[PDB]
Amino acid sequence: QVAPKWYQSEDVPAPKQTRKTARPQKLRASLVPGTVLILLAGRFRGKRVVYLKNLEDNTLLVSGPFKVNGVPLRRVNARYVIATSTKVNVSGVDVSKFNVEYFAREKEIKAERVADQKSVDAALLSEIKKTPLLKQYLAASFSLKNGDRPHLLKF
Amino acid sequence: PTRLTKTRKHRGNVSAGKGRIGKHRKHPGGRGKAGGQHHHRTNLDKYHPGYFGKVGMRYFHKQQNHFWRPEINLDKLWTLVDSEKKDEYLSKSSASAAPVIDTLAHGYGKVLGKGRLPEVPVIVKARFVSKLAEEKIRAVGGVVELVA
Amino acid sequence: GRDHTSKQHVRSGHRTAPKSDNVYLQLLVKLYSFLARRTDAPFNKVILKSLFLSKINRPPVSVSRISRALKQKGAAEKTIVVVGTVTDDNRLLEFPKATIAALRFTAGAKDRILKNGGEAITLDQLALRAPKGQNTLIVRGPRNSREAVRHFGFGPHKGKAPRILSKGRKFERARGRRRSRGFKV
RNA sequence: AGCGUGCUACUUAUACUUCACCGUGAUUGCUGUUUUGACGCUUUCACGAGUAGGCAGGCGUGGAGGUCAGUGACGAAGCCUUUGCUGUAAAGCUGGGUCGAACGGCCUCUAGUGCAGAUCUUGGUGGUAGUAGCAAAUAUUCAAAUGAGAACUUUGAAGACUGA
RNA sequence: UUGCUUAAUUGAACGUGGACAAUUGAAUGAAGAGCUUUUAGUGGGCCAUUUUUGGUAAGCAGAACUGGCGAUGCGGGAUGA
RNA sequence: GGCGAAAGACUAAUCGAACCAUCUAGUAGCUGGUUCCUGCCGAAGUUUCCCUCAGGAUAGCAGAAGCUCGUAUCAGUUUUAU
RNA sequence: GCCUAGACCGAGGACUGCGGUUUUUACCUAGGAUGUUGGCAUAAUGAUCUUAAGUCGCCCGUCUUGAAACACGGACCAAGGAGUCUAACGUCUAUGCGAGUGUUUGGGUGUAAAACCCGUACGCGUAAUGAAAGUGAACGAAGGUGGGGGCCCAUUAGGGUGCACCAUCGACCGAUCCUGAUGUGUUCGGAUGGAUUUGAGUAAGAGCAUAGCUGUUGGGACCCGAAAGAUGGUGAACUAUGCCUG
RNA sequence: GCGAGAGACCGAUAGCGAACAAGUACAGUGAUGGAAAGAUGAAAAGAACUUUGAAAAGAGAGUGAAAAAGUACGUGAAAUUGUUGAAAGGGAAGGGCUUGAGAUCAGACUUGGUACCGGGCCAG
């Protein structure tokens, strides 16, 4: 068997200096805060939610509202969502303190999360009832019926 | 050794390097110098002109010893002087005391005239000598002495 | 596909290293490879390629040829360089005081060089005392004086030596060599 | 979905373009850091069809000099095996089973050194196949004995034949 | 310079010395040019376009130039040197 | 060699020349075969001579080894002139 | 000029370069991919074996212009099975010595077919040419001219010296043809000068020896294969014919 | 022929034809032609005894380090064959490429560092 030599060193070289400076994501023009969304995957696929905020980890902040749908304040990824034409004015919704660390990992839900769900859903439900049938639209799941062509459909 | 031969490399190849069409056979063209005048004329006339025929006279019972006569040239003549005394002889030889070179005793039969001698008298003893060789020896003040 | 204008994968056809397995020749090759790589003096590249040569491509150099090289106008003080063996010549009447650098000296050649007050040195010594080959003169031996060369290109009217094992009146002097025996080529 | 003609898109070769990797040929540089590999390391570019044939680098076998103060009855060699690993490949190594006395790596030397063929040699074994077949010469039968066993032996009783 | 040549101081051939230098006297290209040794197989060929001979003709016989097959896979002509 | 009322019959399953051993591994321009891998290069069926025509030698085509040099003067091509 | 939808790839591994923004020896998209998050590690992930499906795939070897062939060998398996050794050679390469070279026929010696040592001859080389008798290699810096690497002087251009090798004009030795001095065993000798002649020659040696691959010739000659030819023996128990006795 | 010593030789299809009761067995009237065939185990300790069977044998037992050594005897390949298990199958079978399914194999939670740090693999 061929023995190793002295010149077969085991030095692990350092990597070269990478020139890949990361720079901000640009979202779709249709993802405006307040837009009603359709969830395309996950536990809550088919649910229609309200888009609230763009978090700094590239995700989207959504809420059912939880009283309407059963889906709470949580993050979703913009590639797994359909942005519709329906818009709700959320300009009076207080979503300042929702950041990445809010959904940081540590079943039972912390009391603060319940309180914030109540607080946000309050103003949300305030604005929703101004649009007729909007609440019942948000309460109903989305699905593709026979003959529905997503390439021909406006959302 | 057999491990370096192309026989080892030809293993696994059908014809062993002898061709499929030609098919290495026993003696195509004959044996030895067969057909030197017929189908091997194109070889013999090109590479061995003079091969066929007789030239000159026969000599029955040739004895090679009759013709023993090794040649030595003038430019090599001084190698026969004693090497320990060569440098002394060159500077001191004259018409009264010149080195004696016994060419026959050293195994030579004739002295030939190629090259140049030192400008030093020499007594050269030889069975035979060429015409130019003796002139060059006599020109450096030496002499040729015939022996038998 | 390619319409090749020349033959593909052609080795240069020049020897890039000695075929010799002598370790000291390889030491000399190492030295002159460094010298040719780091000096841009043409002498070192010439010496490098010369060390690769085969035996017949390094004919022996006689001391008489060396002394005739030293009689060139202005060459009496040059360092004579032979990549090969320097042999003695007893036809030489006199030999001067000279510095000769060679791979090998025969005993007589070395004795003759030293007796006249000269210097018989090796190629590493030459490199040390002339790293650019200053004041050197390269002498090469006669390549075409080899006996094998007499028989190269034999053919009608070529005037070359036939390949023959015996010499005499009965050996290839008849038909084809004589108009009295047919023809003469 | 025929024939003549014009058009738009579209389909896909081991070809072309860019990239990766292998090899070959060339090519950049490499000693006060050459430092125990300079037959090495390293920069860059182009190229790759092949019978007959040439050359090169390698793989494997018997034996020989040297070496590993090498393996081995606590199991050498051989053999069997979806236990796996390495190599483009020739091949090399290993797990398990079988087994019983020697054997291997490395540097070299050497040859009676590698098989699918030659109506090849010797030995062994299949399909064919439980197959072709065991049909000339008139012809056998009952009972008893013996015996583990009787169409086929012996005895008795018959029926026959050879027909001097 | 010459022994050749001219009636000749004419010539012929080869020269000394001096002048012309990167447009050194068309293009395009050039994995560079030149030289040598040595030796293998091969020495049954066949096909296509064009030219072409004998023949009623032939997947016939025989020449010319080139490209191929032989020695070659690959995509297409269903299949096919 | 025998033998043949003759067929080239018979001469120990052998006869247009028995059997046995040896010379003898007789010679074959002819048929068959010719044993591991990868890498690089890569043909010819043409010239001349041959009792040559299923074979050779010779040149060509191919490989290998290089050697002398380093842009010199070369080209299966064009242009101009002839 | 701008906006916008997909796919494949991520070779390299401190820095070094070219540019850009200049806010500054800083930063950049500028000499080849990074950031972040989830899941898993009793597992998705990969590899092989068997099998199904889709697609393609004629039997190898051989001679041949052309083979899957209605051309030949091959039922199967194991083991054996075919370019060898030698004499003498060509080229090339390695090695030792080198105008020399080769100890090994033999002798000495021995730890005994080894290793170690020794030298006379001899072989090949150092001279060729002619059928032969024979003769036998410097006019000259071993010549002139044109190229020629390297070296030297210079300073790009230029000048000098130029080994190997090449083209060319000469010179020397032997053969051939001519000329024909002094002299003589008066038929010898051959000075000297000439010739579109000729040599496997000279012109500052290159060889000898060992080994290796390849090529050549003689040998069984890569392996197996005739019909034949020869020498010396054995058969008339079958059968042919004569004879003897039944 | 007789007596010795050796080998880079062959190793039971090799080496002499013959390693063995080999010029043997056998063939041909004859001259002549001419094989195959080595190995249990250290030691026969070569299996007493019981039982089934006409017997050969079998099953127990026993000897032995081993009976996966039983005088069909060292190891015991392939062709070919039986049984068992798995799988496939409309006028052959076999092969390459690709993936599925079933089986097998393999790996980083590292030789991990002091509950945290940090790492491996597959993915958005």
Ligand SMILES: CN[C@@H]1[C@@H](O)[C@@H](O[C@@H]2[C@@H](O)[C@H](O[C@H]3O[C@H]([C@@H](C)O)[C@@H](O)[C@H](O)[C@H]3N)[C@@H](N)C[C@H]2N)OC[C@]1(C)O
């Ligand atoms: C002007 N003289 C023409 C000469 O030019 C030549 O013409 C060829 C002609 O024969 C070729 O045509 C040829 O080859 C094609 C095909 C195989 O290429 C065949 O289809 C055709 O039948 C055949 N005649 C054609 N393709 C090009 C012309 N220059 O040959 C024919 C000719 C009459 O001598």
Ligand SMILES: CN[C@@H]1[C@@H](O)[C@@H](O[C@@H]2[C@@H](O)[C@H](O[C@H]3O[C@H]([C@@H](C)O)[C@@H](O)[C@H](O)[C@H]3N)[C@@H](N)C[C@H]2N)OC[C@]1(C)O
């Ligand atoms: C210089 N030219 C000479 C030419 O003259 C000739 O020379 C001859 C020469 O052959 C003669 O010499 C001849 O005859 C003598 C004999 C007579 O002794 C022989 O010894 C010699 O071998 C032979 N060559 C010589 N005796 C006279 C010269 N001129 O030889 C040929 C040549 C070289 O071309």
Ligand SMILES: CN[C@@H]1[C@@H](O)[C@@H](O[C@@H]2[C@@H](O)[C@H](O[C@H]3O[C@H]([C@@H](C)O)[C@@H](O)[C@H](O)[C@H]3N)[C@@H](N)C[C@H]2N)OC[C@]1(C)O
């Ligand atoms: C007697 N006349 C001579 C004429 O014969 C010739 O001389 C040749 C000479 O050229 C030959 O020489 C020729 O051939 C030799 C080779 C054979 O060695 C070469 O070395 C040489 O270079 C070559 N020129 C020489 N071998 C013989 C003379 N007679 O030279 C011219 C001349 C003077 O007219």
Ligand SMILES: CN[C@@H]1[C@@H](O)[C@@H](O[C@@H]2[C@@H](O)[C@H](O[C@H]3O[C@H]([C@@H](C)O)[C@@H](O)[C@H](O)[C@H]3N)[C@@H](N)C[C@H]2N)OC[C@]1(C)O
């Ligand atoms: C340096 N002096 C040289 C001297 O050494 C010698 O040189 C020869 C030369 O003449 C030879 O060359 C000669 O012979 C060859 C031969 C092949 O025929 C021919 O080229 C030609 O006849 C002639 N030039 C050459 N082959 C070797 C040199 N050493 O010849 C005389 C000389 C030219 O003066």
Ligand SMILES: CN[C@@H]1[C@@H](O)[C@@H](O[C@@H]2[C@@H](O)[C@H](O[C@H]3O[C@H]([C@@H](C)O)[C@@H](O)[C@H](O)[C@H]3N)[C@@H](N)C[C@H]2N)OC[C@]1(C)O
């Ligand atoms: C019992 N039958 C006898 C018998 O003596 C037979 O012996 C063989 C014997 O030779 C074998 O033994 C064998 O051993 C090796 C190896 C290949 O096995 C062989 O190379 C060797 O020739 C042979 N001794 C043995 N394994 C079985 C017995 N029947 O040999 C002859 C025979 C007549 O068949």
